[PDB]
Design a protein around this nucleic acid. Structure first.
Ligand SMILES: [Zn+2]
Ligand SMILES: [Zn+2]
Ligand SMILES: [Zn+2]
Ligand SMILES: [Zn+2]
Ligand SMILES: [Zn+2]
Lengths: 74, 70
DNA sequence: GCGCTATTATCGCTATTAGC
DNA sequence: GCTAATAGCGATAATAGCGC
């Protein structure tokens, strides 16, 4: 009866086995120890949808600033 | 009908404290940025995200047209 | 770097609500 | 009275991370 349980801590803290604060997008542990941008988290099954949404919202936002920027250029 | 528990706690099947802007369950697990509450029915929301999908496609197409014309 | 235990988090099942 | 729908518990699988 395995449970598909994915760690919420970041890969580095997990690999190093240290305390993870879980800060996004990069945790304070990684930042405090000089590997901030090496910090990332595993995708959660129950987060996929909420992620798809956040990202999609960001894309419409940036794509629109882009249409405006391009137009406001040529 | 519109659920009172944030979508994540719903999917996680845990009790939501329904605190805003983000509940403590999401907060504590580090996913507060993904914590949100529904403002409309599931049908209304699904339809909204469907239109977003299409508008997105049309945008990516417009940017190509625009830049690939610059 | 990792072993070992404390604490956490998944998912089947139960309790409760909504509806016929 | 009964079946579906939604919420949410809780047993236990499995991580978190202290401390060596
Ligand atoms: Zn971390
Ligand atoms: Zn970075
Ligand atoms: Zn990190
Ligand atoms: Zn919640
Ligand atoms: Zn939440």
């Amino acid at each position: 009866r395995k449970r598909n349980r994915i760690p919420l801590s970041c890969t580095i803290c997990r690999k190093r086995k240290v305390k993870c604060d879980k800060l996004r997008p990069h945790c304070q542990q990684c930042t405090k120890t000089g590997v901030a941008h090496l910090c990332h988290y595993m995708e959660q099954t129950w987060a996929e949808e909420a992620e798809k949404e956040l990202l999609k919202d960001n894309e419409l936002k940036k794509l629109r600033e882009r249409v405006k920027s391009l137009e406001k250029t040529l």
